[PDB]
Amino acid sequence: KEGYLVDYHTGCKYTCAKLGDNDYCVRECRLRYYQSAHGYCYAFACWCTHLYEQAVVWPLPNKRCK
DSSP states (O other): OOEEOOOTTTOOOOBOSSBTOOTTHHHHHHHHSOTTOEEEEETTEEEEESOOTTOOSTTSSOOOOO
């Protein structure tokens, strides 16, 4: 499973270096979910990958950047 990185209360994106320069992005994904998560910087913003069924993202109730 895959999903865009967003905060549960701030509703905002998490920006990073181009695509595969994912060194900051993987460290968010593996602390947001289980440590077995992964990700990359799709359009210079973090996109988590190799995820379980318990990842959700867009079905959140608000998710607009405060």
